[PDB]
Design a protein around this motif. Sequence first.
Motif, PDB file in Angstrom:
ATOM      1  N   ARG A  21       0.776  -1.248   0.000  1.00 24.24           N
ATOM      2  CA  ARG A  21       0.000   0.000   0.000  1.00 24.24           C
ATOM      3  C   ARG A  21       0.808   1.300   0.000  1.00 24.24           C
ATOM      4  NH1 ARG A  21      -2.790  -0.710   5.442  1.00 24.24           N
ATOM      5  NH2 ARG A  21      -3.376   1.469   5.013  1.00 24.24           N
TER       6      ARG A  21
ATOM      7  N   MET B  65      -3.893  10.584   2.264  1.00 27.55           N
ATOM      8  CA  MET B  65      -2.926   9.497   2.409  1.00 27.55           C
ATOM      9  C   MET B  65      -2.482   9.534   3.866  1.00 27.55           C
ATOM     10  SD  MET B  65      -2.463   8.071  -0.546  1.00 27.55           S
ATOM     11  CE  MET B  65      -0.742   7.395  -0.649  1.00 27.55           C
ATOM     12  N   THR B 103      -1.832   4.386   1.138  1.00 25.64           N
ATOM     13  CA  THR B 103      -3.238   4.646   0.876  1.00 25.64           C
ATOM     14  C   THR B 103      -4.029   4.066   2.069  1.00 25.64           C
ATOM     15  OG1 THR B 103      -3.263   2.506  -0.281  1.00 25.64           O
ATOM     16  CG2 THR B 103      -2.983   4.495  -1.583  1.00 25.64           C
TER      17      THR B 103
END
Lengths: 105, 108
Positions: A21, B65, B103
């Motif tokens: 991620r 983010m 993320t």
Amino acid sequence: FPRTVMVNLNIHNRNSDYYNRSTSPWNLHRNEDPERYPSVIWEAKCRHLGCINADGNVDYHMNSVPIQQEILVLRREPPHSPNSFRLEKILVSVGCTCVTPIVHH
Amino acid sequence: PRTVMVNLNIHNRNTNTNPDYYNRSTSPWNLHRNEDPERYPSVIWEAKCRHLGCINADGNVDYHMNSVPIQQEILVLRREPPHSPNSFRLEKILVSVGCTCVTPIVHH
Ligand SMILES: Cc1nonc1C(=O)N[C@H](c1nc(C[C@H]2CCc3ncc(Br)n3C2)n[nH]1)C1CCCCC1
């Protein structure tokens, strides 16, 4: 202080997908050494030179860089000894972060 | 074996092979000192992310983010019996080593 100490190796425990991620994602490589305790060290290698942007594309204006940790390990001494070691200090990459590059002519 | 000997006279190993990220990062952090006289190493430095978000191209915080600490499972020696100068047991802890920008996980 003592030069040699005793250690009981029966560990007591005391109290993720970031690699995929992260904008600076990484993969883990397993490093095994039978002459070391812990025998296995997991090392991060950055997947890209750049960082991933909002669109999912690589932004080459930023760099993925490994974050290195100084750690101690036990190395068997003498070699192959089951029960005697010396502490050794190594550097291990534990993940990656995205940084602005250093620029100079 | 349950008990082993350890020589505390550390030898460096390749610390000069591939030897300011905390400040240059889009998920910057600072290190805080943690001291415990009953533990070896007595001093451990722990990273704390500076922001909840990440720093964008304009130098501002992007709240879409997240800065997150990268935690590493680390072994330490704990004196056993308490206050012993020369006998220990291994213990496993988590240490934050730095931060990365991810993320968020979203529930749709
Ligand atoms: C930093 C730090 N602050 O406090 N103590 C340390 C520290 O170096 N402890 C050592 C340590 N723990 C591990 C677990 C490894 C699990 C697998 C792995 N993959 C990547 C990494 Br990094 N690791 C880490 N190796 N070495 C032990 C100290 C006493 C003798 C036993 C070793």
